[PDB]
Each structure stands twice: as C-alpha cells, then as structure tokens.
Amino acid sequence: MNILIFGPNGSGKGTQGNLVKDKYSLAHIESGGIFREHIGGGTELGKKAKEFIDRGDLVPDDITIPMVLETLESKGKDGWLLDGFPRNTVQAQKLFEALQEKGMKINFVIEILLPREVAKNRIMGRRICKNNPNHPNNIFIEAIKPNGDVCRVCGGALSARADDQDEGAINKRHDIYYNTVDGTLAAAYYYKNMAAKEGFVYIELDGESIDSIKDTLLAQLA
Ligand SMILES: [Fe+3]
C-alpha cells in the first residue's frame, strides 16, 4: 500500500499520517528524513546534493527525485506514506514519471482540506500548558478551547510559542501551499485530475472533529 498525503500547516496532517501508517503498517517517509538518509549516510546522490546545500542552493529536482525514489525502494519496500514532498507541480510531475519508470504504483492520495484563514488561525490559536505540554489547548478550536487564561486539562499556566505567532513565516509557508498555479495545492490537483486515469483513489478530508476525521479515512482504505 502506497500513499501520498497533502495538507497545510495546522491541519493535523502529521497526526493523521501517523494514525494511517500504524493501522496499515507503512513506512512514514518524510521529506526531511530523506535528505538525512542521503546527505547523512553519504549516498552518491547525497554527496552531489550536499555540494548545492553547502553553497546556499536548493537541490535540483533531477537529484531530489532520484533520492525520493531510492528511499521509497529501500525504506518503503513494504508500503509507504510520503509527507511533505512534492511541494510543487514541476516536482509532482517529475515524481510521478519517476514512479512509473520504476513501476511503483500509488494507491491513495489524501488531501486535508482547510481554508487558508482557518489554518493560520489554528496555528495562532494554539497555547501551551506549562505543566504538561501535551495538553491540547486552542483558542480557535472549540472542542479544545482553553479555560480562561489556563489549561483546559489541569489548569496550569499556558503560554504561546512565538513560532506560532510568526505571521511572517506562516504566510510564507502558506503562500506556497495554497498556491494553485504551481504550488502544493496545484501538485495535489494534478494528482486529483489523474486519479481515475491511473486508478488510485483520491481522498478528501474536511480538516474542521480531530477523531471523526480519523475514521472518515480509516473507513476509506481497505
Ligand atoms: Fe495542562
């Protein structure tokens, strides 16, 4: 079983991913760890990539893509979930041609739908209990709305991390995702539009009841 998953920052994508690869026993291949296996453990491609990195440059796709495929072959031999790559349409199209050339089928693409404005807001609405950071508090998600200026769960003092209030970096990351011309949503639409031709199933998830979404999906797989 081979899955792609797409979703903006603050859609709980990593969470849904995790739930999926547990239930179906898949290897969660994330775009960061690909470069670690390579650029760390020094593969032929890692070595060539690091020359670009060490210069202030991004890796070109004809290095990036072969790398993604090598990780999928070796770590993904029994089923994989790809999160975070492809970020764009040039990458998406190249990825898909590379996949066909190596005969790896996609079985499901998953897209977590969520409006730009609502996504920013779940990032910004997110407060951390000082007693236990796992205690989920969010001004903008009702189910988990905090209790005054203190933790919904245990009533400890809760603060904001200022990476969550960095509208600079959040909008840069979202300008890329919600880019329907050639960015991440364009990458997902590209797959959506060939789902039937290629015979994979494309699953849309309403990103706005954390565990009623976790079985709109569990239901739709195998
Ligand atoms: Fe707490």
UniProtKB/TrEMBL annotation:
Pfam entry (one): ADK
Pathway noted in the entry: Purine metabolism; AMP biosynthesis via salvage pathway; AMP from ADP: step 1/1
Catalytic reactions of this protein: AMP + ATP = 2 ADP
UniProt keywords, alphabetically: ATP-binding, Cytoplasm, Kinase, Metal-binding, Nucleotide biosynthesis, Nucleotide-binding, Transferase, Zinc
Cell compartment(s), UniProt: Cytoplasm
KW Transmembrane (keyword) present: no
Residue span of region NMP: 30-59
GO molecular function: AMP kinase activity; ATP binding; metal ion binding
Protein EC: 2.7.4.3
Residue positions binding AMP: 31, 36, 57-59, 84-87, 91, 161, 173
UniProt-annotated binding residues for Fe(3+): 129, 135, 151, 154
Residues noted as binding ATP in the record, renumbered to the chain: 10-15, 126
UniProt xrefs under CDD domains: ADK (cd01428)
Enzyme class: transferase
Chain sites annotated for binding Zn(2+): 129, 135, 151, 154
GO CC terms of this entry: cytoplasm
Assigned protein family: Belongs to the adenylate kinase family.
Domain notes: Consists of three domains, a large central CORE domain and two small peripheral domains, NMPbind and LID, which undergo movements during catalysis. The LID domain closes over the site of phosphoryl transfer upon ATP binding. Assembling and dissambling the active center during each catalytic cycle provides an effective means to prevent ATP hydrolysis.
Protein name, as recorded: Adenylate kinase
Source species of the chain: Megalodesulfovibrio gigas (Desulfovibrio gigas)
Gene behind the chain: ak
